[PDB]
């Protein structure tokens, strides 16, 4: 009988690599439905901060109004979640908008002529000709502004090219940003590409010694197949550096003495972050939000 | 968000059409996975659509004028102090002209004119089922030597046209198709790398449509999307000796993907690998 | 028109890798292959974003009806 | 000798400033040749 302690004595983790932007770890003998539930809940359910409403004042720029509001919405922010809780939508906006629900970032840029010796880059022809993401000045307001005194609201990338300006054109606006889940609008998704893959298993049916392994090793990445000498038949170094391409199936020499399979139990996960999350805490919240989705039904009787 | 074709004709650069991009490039996955396509109809990714996947705008121009004629001027723009209803400042100024960048529905004031004969200011509203944005207003007064007074203003509207479900996207090979459903990336099948295809085409169209170019540019565009090169189409350069599936196949072989182009995919709903590999590539 | 951000297929931010890409082509005189690999774009979904962008905004701005030519 | 490829550092150069010399792309100008050439010859040529 399958039990939790019988699955716990077999379940293991193997973190292959880790970084402040991307982490790649391995899960041993876990079910595909549970692994797919983790990936599916990581790409959709994890909350994030993003611009939700736009209040424009002057958009004389050549870039259209709704397009600028579209790009400002897509601009990611390095704002840690769980500081601003969820906001209701049924009540009117005049009291729905509080400092605890949303935080506001402003933008006020004007372009003027700058004389210089003339094909020439616009960096020395005008003033503030290109408005980057760093120009989005967060506005500390409301009841609690000390919560951001440690780390200010900074966009995830200050080099994002939002718009370009010309003399006589101005940009004045205030932007309200709230939290949201990726299912409503995928701009709230802090993950770049949440995906997993099965470890490609390779079976050796016949001896590969001789010049056969000299051409067999190059069909795969060099780090996959290892050779010792003319004897001691070649083996595999590690099946994790092997990208599944089925290159050996084209040759009739290897089409009979090798088989490419899949380990239905060993998964590897490689997750990225947009800037508001970390690849470790977002998986910690992944198992937590799934632990919350089903516990919400555990302590809940049935109706009818 | 128009882009140039990865695989383009040799004369596409000679014509200077790079100045006018007419389409974009995205990852095509020829699958029947979803099940909402029993024809050449396609399915876009909802996560790609919310990022600007094929974003377009419309521009209308209406010339509103009050001049019927040598005759004395009767209608006058602006406002007369005789009588006035309220709630007309949110759309117009004090001169009877609308502000720039205001959202107008059908039944909203767009330009108000006063008339001295009927001693009553009446509004002529914009009537169109699609509510648009106000972009430009042009003041023109002419056909007169020394007497000037405006009786013709050219208002210009812009229509935010987000690509909804129901529009007609198509490739450049006659592959007609209407958007069946905006499939979200939550249940979209993900490849070995982790990219979700923003378009799905039913493979059952090819036997009747009789098209192979969109296949060969799905490998050419895939090779170019890795090596950075831009393959040139320039038809009548390939023959039975060197087939394009082989010439473009060796580039995928030395790139790290499959020689034929069949990339191993993973299903979205259950999560296990599909039976066979999925044909993946990019098409303009 | 303007350089896109949050590539449709993958989702990685790309709008911040356009001017730095033009610098890698003009200054270092590199090829399109290495100039794309240096910016940190491994997947061909986000690679083709700025590898093929036209950036018509540099030509739309030449029409400024608010100041003398 | 890569292929018949495109270019960005050279196309964006045209987007910065149009050439003060003759019009670039000397192939699209021949597309209106039957139109502008016919109306040109209406006044151009000997005897008006």
């Amino acid at each position: 009988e399958w039990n939790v302690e019988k699955f716990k004595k077999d379940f293991e983790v193997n973190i292959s690599s880790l970084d402040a932007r991307e982490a790649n770890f391995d899960l041993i003998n876990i079910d595909t439905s549970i692994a797919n539930a983790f990936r599916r809940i990581m790409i959709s359910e994890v909350p994030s901060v993003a611009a939700e409403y736009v209040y424009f004042f002057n958009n004389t720029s050549v870039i259209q109004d709704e397009v600028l509001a579209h790009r400002i919405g897509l601009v990611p922010l390095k704002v840690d979640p769980d500081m601003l809780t969820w906001v209701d939508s049924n009540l009117p906006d005049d009291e729905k908008f509080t400092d605890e629900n949303t935080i506001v970032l402003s933008l006020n840029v004007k372009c003027t002529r700058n004389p210089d010796a003339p094909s020439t880059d616009p960096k020395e022809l005008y003033n503030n000709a290109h408005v980057y993401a760093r120009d989005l000045k967060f506005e500390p307001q409301g009841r609690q502004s000390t919560t951001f005194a440690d780390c200010p609201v900074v966009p995830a990338d200050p080099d994002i090219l939002l718009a370009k300006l010309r003399p006589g054109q101005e940009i004045s606006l205030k932007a309200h940003c709230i939290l949201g889940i990726g299912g409503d609008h995928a701009k709230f998704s802090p993950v770049s590409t949440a995906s997993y893959r099965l470890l490609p298993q390779i079976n050796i049916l016949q001896p590969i010694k001789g010049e056969s392994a000299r051409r067999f090793q190059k069909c795969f990445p060099p780090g996959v197949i290892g050779i010792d000498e003319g004897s001691d038949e070649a083996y595999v170094k590690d099946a994790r550096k092997d990208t599944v391409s089925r290159e050996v199936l084209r040759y009739e020499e290897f089409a009979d003495k090798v088989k490419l399979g899949r380990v239905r139990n060993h998964f590897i996960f490689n997750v990225e972050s947009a800037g508001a999350m970390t690849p470790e805490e977002i998986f910690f919240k992944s198992v937590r939000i799934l632990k919350n989705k089903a516990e919400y039904l555990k302590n809940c009787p049935i109706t009818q | 968000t128009g882009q140039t074709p990865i695989v383009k004709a040799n004369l596409y650069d000679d014509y200077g059409m790079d100045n006018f991009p007419n389409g974009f490039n995205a990852v095509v996955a020829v699958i029947s996975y979803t099940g909402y396509d029993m024809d050449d109809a396609m399915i876009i990714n909802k996560s790609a659509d919310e990022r600007g996947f094929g974003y377009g705008t419309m521009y209308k121009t209406e010339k509103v004028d009050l001049a019927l004629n040598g005759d004395p001027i009767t209608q006058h723009f602006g406002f007369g102090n005789d009588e006035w209803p309220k709630e007309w400042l949110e759309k117009l100024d004090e001169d009877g002209l609308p502000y720039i960048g205001t959202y107008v529905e059908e039944g909203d004031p767009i330009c108000a004119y006063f008339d001295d004969t009927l001693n009553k200011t009446k509004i002529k509203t914009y009537h169109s089922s699609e509510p648009a944005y106000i972009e430009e207003v042009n003041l023109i007064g002419d056909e007169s030597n020394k007497f000037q007074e405006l009786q013709t203003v050219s208002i210009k509207y812009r229509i935010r046209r987000t690509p909804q479900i129901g529009d007609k996207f198509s490739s450049r090979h006659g592959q007609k198709g209407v958007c069946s459903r905006k499939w979200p990336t939550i249940d979209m099948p993900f490849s070995e790398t982790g990219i979700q295809p923003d378009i799905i085409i039913n493979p059952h169209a090819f036997p009747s449509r009789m098209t192979i170019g969109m296949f060969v540019e799905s490998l050419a565009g895939k090779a170019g999307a890795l090596h950075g090169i831009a393959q040139d189409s320039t038809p009548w350069i390939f023959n039975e000796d060197d087939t394009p599936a082989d010439y473009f196949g060796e580039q995928l072989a030395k790139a790290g993907y499959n020689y034929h182009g069949n990339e191993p995919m993973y299903s979205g709903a259950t999560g296990e690998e599909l039976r066979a590999d999925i044909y993946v590539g990019v098409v303009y | 028109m303007i350089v896109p951000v949050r590539c449709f297929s993958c989702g990685k931010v790309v709008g911040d890798k356009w001017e730095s890409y033009l610098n890698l082509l003009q200054e270092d005189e590199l090829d399109e292959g290495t100039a794309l690999s240096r910016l940190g774009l491994k997947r061909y979904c986000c690679r083709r974003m700025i590898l093929t962008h036209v950036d018509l905004i540099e030509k739309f701005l030449r029409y400024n009806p608010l100041e003398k030519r | 000798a890569r292929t018949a490829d495109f270019r960005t550092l050279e196309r964006e150069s045209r987007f910065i400033n149009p050439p003060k010399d003759k019009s670039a792309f000397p192939l699209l100008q021949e597309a209106v040749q039957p139109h502008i050439g016919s109306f040109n010859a209406l006044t151009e040529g000997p005897d008006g």
Binding site: P222, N270 | H227, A255 | K42 | R2
Partner: peptide
């Protein structure tokens, strides 16, 4: 007829999801 000029100087520009161009 001369064959189509093959693009020269190409390497492996793709690897596993968590492995970079570390293998020569």
């Amino acid at each position: 007829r001369k064959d189509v000029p093959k693009v020269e100087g190409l390497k492996l520009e793709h690897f596993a999801t968590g492995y970079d161009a570390e293998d020569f």
